[PDB]
Design a protein around this ligand. Structure first.
Ligand SMILES: Nc1ncnc2c1ncn2[C@@H]1O[C@H](COP(=O)(O)OP(=O)(O)O)[C@@H](O)[C@H]1O
Ligand SMILES: [Co+2]
Ligand SMILES: [Co+2]
Ligand SMILES: [Co+2]
Ligand SMILES: [Co+2]
Ligand SMILES: [Mg+2]
Length: 448
């Protein structure tokens, strides 16, 4: 019945689905709520890739330093409870429902005042729920991931003392040409002038035109800036059983023998970015044992996460060229597979061709399918896209994800039976958050 109540809430929220760049609705709602989102400090995270992983690393580090955290991330993989976490764990379905019920009369009032002056969007309501729940807990620090962009995102009502910008590239596609400067500018909108110490902008690796824009906006916000490879850096990294071992230069010095239980060079970069952000937040050197303990406790469900071995099955949320490239490089560099089959479903607003082109060098073949989202590309369209990069001989189709996994499985069994192929095989389920999340539920894992 807890689960059932949660389903009732989601059914309503899903009926909501216009933009409000002035942040009028969510600002009004926060006023009615008593401005809960101003009653704790936040670390605020924007960018194209690594936002969620960095958010979870920040949470882990702040928790290892023994402050009580709240964390809001998006999208969710399996259950919307994942979007609001306290003390490093999703809240329960009962708490999620109680949070919605407690703000609902004020949400209804904004919905009505708005339509008498558009309803509030589902993201606006989720964001208000996270902020209310953080004040209900209460937390010492909130870690807040942008839903989309930054400047006009519903989370952008917090004036965060630390703003973090992870690597920026293309993800959502409106045009063939890219306004990388306009893209950078929107995300920079979370770097705000402090009322207090000046805001700190902590910036991961960027292309030059992006960096220029971010530095300009940091100047407009009076923000201090820390940049990867100038103020902090990954110094050394070794692959290790279960992940990797790092030596990081943070803002307060060198931290050594950091074991991070996640695969991928990109996760090393997300780690040092998270470290510099937590250092900035506390004014850092941080206790090195607490930094080692926080990193060791990091999870990032659905980011190159292994569901089993013999055969190995990975799930990965990659849904843009930069992420599919990080995934392909990790599979090639940190493992020794003799045969890999991809199981793929991708949403229609992504750079599908860029995703396939990054994965073609590592997937011996691919099974394309539909992950159940209304926004997913249909199987026939994805099959043709795949065919253009893989050749039709390396492409198969399946009506749904469970079928697609069964197809991949028989391909990997055949490879295993093929003396000059794999007589060290794996299946990689990717292409979307929804694809990764649905697969995670098929493999029976609880939301994290
Ligand atoms: N720094 C990074 N660079 C490139 N790809 C990344 C990075 N961090 C994560 N990824 C890839 O992007 C996917 C989504 O990662 P996540 O940490 O959820 O980012 P976001 O919250 O920005 O969407 C991951 O599965 C992984 O493939
Ligand atoms: Co995310
Ligand atoms: Co669009
Ligand atoms: Co010690
Ligand atoms: Co053979
Ligand atoms: Mg994305």
């Amino acid at each position: 019945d807890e689960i059932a109540s949660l389903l009732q809430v989601e059914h309503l929220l899903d009926q909501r689905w216009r933009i409000d760049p002035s942040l009028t609705r969510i600002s009004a709602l926060m006023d009615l709520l008593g401005s809960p989102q101003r009653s704790y400090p936040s670390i605020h995270i924007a960018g194209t890739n690594g936002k969620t992983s960095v958010a979870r690393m920040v949470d882990a580090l702040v928790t290892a330093l023994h402050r009580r955290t709240g964390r809001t991330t998006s999208p969710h993989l399996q259950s919307p409870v994942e979007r609001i976490s306290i003390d490093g764990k999703p809240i329960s379905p009962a708490q999620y429902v109680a949070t919605y019920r407690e703000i609902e009369p004020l949400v209804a009032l904004i919905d009505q005042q708005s339509q008498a002056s558009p309803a509030m969007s589902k993201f606006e309501v989720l964001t208000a729920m996270a902020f209310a729940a953080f004040a209900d807990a209460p937390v010492d620090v909130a870690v807040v991931e942008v839903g989309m962009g930054g400047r006009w995102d519903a989370t952008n009502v917090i004036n965060a003392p630390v703003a973090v910008i992870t690597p920026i590239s293309i993800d959502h596609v409106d045009y063939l040409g890219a306004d990388i400067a306009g893209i950078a500018g929107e995300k920079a909108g979370i770097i705000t002038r402090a009322p207090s110490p000046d805001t700190v902008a902590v910036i991961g690796r960027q292309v030059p035109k992006v960096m220029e824009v971010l530095l300009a906006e940091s100047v407009r916000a009076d923000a201090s800036v820390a940049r990867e490879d100038s103020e902090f850096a990954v110094l050394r990294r070794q692959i290790a059983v279960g992940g990797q071992v790092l030596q990081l230069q943070g803002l307060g010095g060198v931290y050594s023998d950091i074991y991070l239980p996640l695969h991928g060079e990109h996760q090393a970069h997300n780690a040092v970015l998270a470290l510099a952000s937590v250092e900035a937040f506390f004014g850092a050197q941080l206790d090195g044992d607490a930094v080692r303990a926080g990193f060791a406790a990091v999870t990032s469900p659905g980011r190159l996460e292994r569901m089993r071995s013999a055969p190995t099955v990975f799930i990965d949320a990659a849904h843009n060229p930069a992420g599919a490239s990080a995934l392909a490089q990790t599979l090639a560099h940190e493992f020794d597979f003799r045969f890999l089959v991809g199981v793929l479903s991708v949403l229609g607003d992504k750079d599908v061709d860029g995703i396939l082109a990054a994965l073609e060098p590592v997937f011996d073949s691919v099974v394309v399918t539909h992950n159940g989202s209304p926004r997913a590309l249909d199987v026939e369209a994805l099959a043709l896209a795949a065919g253009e990069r893989f050749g039709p001989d390396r492409v198969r189709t399946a009506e749904n994800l469970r079928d697609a996994i069964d197809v991949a499985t028989s391909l990997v069994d055949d490879a295993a039976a093929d003396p000059d192929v794999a007589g060290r095989t794996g299946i990689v389920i990717t292409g979307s958050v929804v694809t990764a999340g649905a697969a995670r539920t098929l493999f029976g894992r609880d939301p994290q």
